[PDB]
Amino acid sequence: ASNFTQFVLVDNGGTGDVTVAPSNFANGVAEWISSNSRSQAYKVTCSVRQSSAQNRKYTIKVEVPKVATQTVGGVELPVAAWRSYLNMELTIPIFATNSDCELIVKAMQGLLKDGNPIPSAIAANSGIY
Amino acid sequence: ASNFTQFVLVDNGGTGDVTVAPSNFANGVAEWISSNSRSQAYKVTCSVRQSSAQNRKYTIKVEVPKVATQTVGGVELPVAAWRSYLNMELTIPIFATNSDCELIVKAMQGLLKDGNPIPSAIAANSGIY
Amino acid sequence: ASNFTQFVLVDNGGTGDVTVAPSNFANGVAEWISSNSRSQAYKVTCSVRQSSAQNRKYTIKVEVPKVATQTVGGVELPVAAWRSYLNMELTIPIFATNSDCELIVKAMQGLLKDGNPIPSAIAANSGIY
Amino acid sequence: ASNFTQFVLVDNGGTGDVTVAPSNFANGVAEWISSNSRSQAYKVTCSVRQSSAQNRKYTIKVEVPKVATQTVGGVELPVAAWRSYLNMELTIPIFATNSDCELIVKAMQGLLKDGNPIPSAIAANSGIY
Amino acid sequence: ASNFTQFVLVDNGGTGDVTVAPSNFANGVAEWISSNSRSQAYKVTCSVRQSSAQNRKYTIKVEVPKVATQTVGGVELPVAAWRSYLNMELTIPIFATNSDCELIVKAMQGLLKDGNPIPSAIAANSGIY
Amino acid sequence: ASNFTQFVLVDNGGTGDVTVAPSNFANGVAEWISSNSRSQAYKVTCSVRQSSAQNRKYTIKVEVPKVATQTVGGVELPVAAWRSYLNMELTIPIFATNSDCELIVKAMQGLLKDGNPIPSAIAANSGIY
RNA sequence: CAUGAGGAUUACCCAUG
RNA sequence: CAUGAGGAUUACCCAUG
RNA sequence: CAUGAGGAUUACCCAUG
RNA sequence: CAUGAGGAUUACCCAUG
């Protein structure tokens, strides 16, 4: 085994999928990037630290770019018009068993499932009401 | 589309599901909690704001109880040993269309999909290797 | 659901009832007022705060006015001769389950039931003896 | 009308009722307690005074025990995790007649009547939404 | 119950309608925003405060954008060519009954009804003549 | 042709209507006043100016009185117990075509249509909730 | 290290403790 | 934030810690 | 907090009281 | 002239730039 593998970040149903692959592990930060120039790539990073005597903290980051072609000094360069960022920190007590952790994973999946409140608000540029 | 409604946070196959329901709306911060004491409840809060002239920011927090060896309705101290905290911040530039935001939601779903690196690590009390 | 609804504050048996309706939620303070000028209205406010690491505190206020018509500078204005105020604070530990909380509600209802000591003293402008 | 008597604080339908009885009268502060250790008892205290030239003030305090997972007669620490505190202050201008005061009692009963917003929120470990 | 809901700001029949939805309600300022790019969205805000002892004051704001596409260096972004701003303050004495407030609303609707002097002037880039 | 004419400010059907008529147009400020005592009359004013190189600005004001009779020393005068004041500024860039201005007017009418959030709050002495 | 419905051009910065 | 059988013209103020 | 037919890039900025 | 969820007794007054 080894869980540092590539995966589908954006599932557009087999055609136009955004897959992301392992690209670096320097300084304890696992990194993944899509097959693009570094200026237009999707990026995912993850690190874990024992943040206290009794806690462990996962720091995860995702960068979603809006690709574009920009003319700088008369020449065309592949660039990112802008980027959206997701920063998440998860603090889990050292007393959580594997089944306690599975519960946390399920909660995160349920939180973002299509049709639920939060993903619905975000996708519609709206708040909760 | 009034989206502030009850939803399934933890899908256990219909039996043993954890539903979370609207519980507070003070200050634009929407809150949902499971049917438990507040010390053992599943809690979800969400809010949106314009962080700067160029960005909007969603702050989403989730609290998940440690269940193994839990005494339902009891007093469990210290609090930090029985609870996990998830803090998510999503920064989206003001130029993002609904389509752009839909793709951002897909990226979040893909990141946590069953079998992928991040959720596998978290569920196995592991890091990346 | 949504518990921010209108309700009968003073039950004079269907004729002369004082109902109070939602009127504001600015700054996390839920407000209710009767259908009157703001100078003669009954008023109810409620807010909840996590006042400590392990407590939650409800702050509730009720204003009962003595309506009157006052001549100021030769003109008649709807005003309140005086007002009676009820301020209550309820501190509940985060360890209280839903059934523990129902117990608190029942205790408050029993405290004020017709015929019992406290409501009897108040209604008679007397103390307890 | 000597009103300092025993009364039913928690009405559970005749079976499992909680009666509270006169227990102290030191300094004009009337007290009632249930038949329990003082750490697990239901306590009610009440006093009246002339707070200023224009007002009279009733101070009513209620203490309710957390019952779920309670060990009858046992030592439960910390105290703050096993008890809820209600503090009520009622300010009534000296011009209030008995009729005025009767209406004030009705407002308090209406505020806490079953099904209304405030008691529903409290009983469901919720706020207003 | 809630009035912090979605509503039609611009009625262009059944199709082409501009709907504005709740987004944030921080510090007493309710805000509504239309869908899609925040940069090209319609915005409405509202708040109320006790400006003095006798007056309450509403502050309402509306922004109408002129949708356009910006192209800089070959990179196009959805923007607002410019915006029209509406700022209105409404002072209402605390003596106003509900009947009085309904009349105030009728006056506001009448001031802007099709065919009347003011909306006709505005709609035609004109003044009074 | 002229838009400085008489118009219905308050439409109470066909009878009880408040009509306001032209009175003065000095220094770029058009003014309309209802009939009878100036002291109890409704007032509307309007003006436009080039606030800067790119913007034109409308300043509209409305006064709604509460009719009352004042009695001082046995001498009664028709007066206004108090007044409600509406002040609105509308900034419209010089690039706005007539089509753009019609949309701005529709937004203003939509903001105040019966049933929508803002007029409902005002009509009920309420804020947003 | 800790907290922030703190910010960012995102493995950085700020405030508080 | 905490306490007061502290006050008020009641979402404020005071004293103590 | 109050006034402005004060301005704006619109919950900000200015003058006066 | 510009900004203020600044106030008013509302074409006035204030603060800031």
UniProtKB/Swiss-Prot annotation, chains A, B, C, D, E, F:
Primary localization class, coarse: virion
A single Gene Ontology CC term: T=3 icosahedral viral capsid
Protein name per Swiss-Prot or TrEMBL: Capsid protein
One Pfam family named in its UniProt record: Levi_coat
Start and end residues of each stretch annotated as Viral RNA-binding: 31-104
Keyword RNA-binding: yes
Stored InterPro entries: Levivir_coat, Phage_RNA-type_capsid
Annotated GO biological process: negative regulation of viral translation; regulation of translation
Family that this chain belongs to: Belongs to the Leviviricetes capsid protein family.
Molecular function GO labels: identical protein binding; RNA binding; structural molecule activity
Summary of subunit composition and partner proteins: Homodimer. The capsid proteins form dimers that assemble by group of 5. Twelve such pentamers are linked together with free dimers. The homodimers binds to the viral RNA via an operator hairpin, but also to many other RNA sequences in the viral genome; this interaction probably shifts the virus from the replicative to the assembly phase and ensures specific encapsidation of the viral genome.
Localization in the cell: Virion
Keyword presence, Zinc: no
Role according to the record: Capsid protein self-assembles to form an icosahedral capsid with a T=3 symmetry, about 26 nm in diameter, and consisting of 89 capsid proteins dimers (178 capsid proteins). Involved in viral genome encapsidation through the interaction between a capsid protein dimer and the multiple packaging signals present in the RNA genome. The capsid also contains 1 copy of the A2 maturation protein.
Keywords: Capsid protein, RNA-binding, T=3 icosahedral capsid protein, Translation regulation, Virion
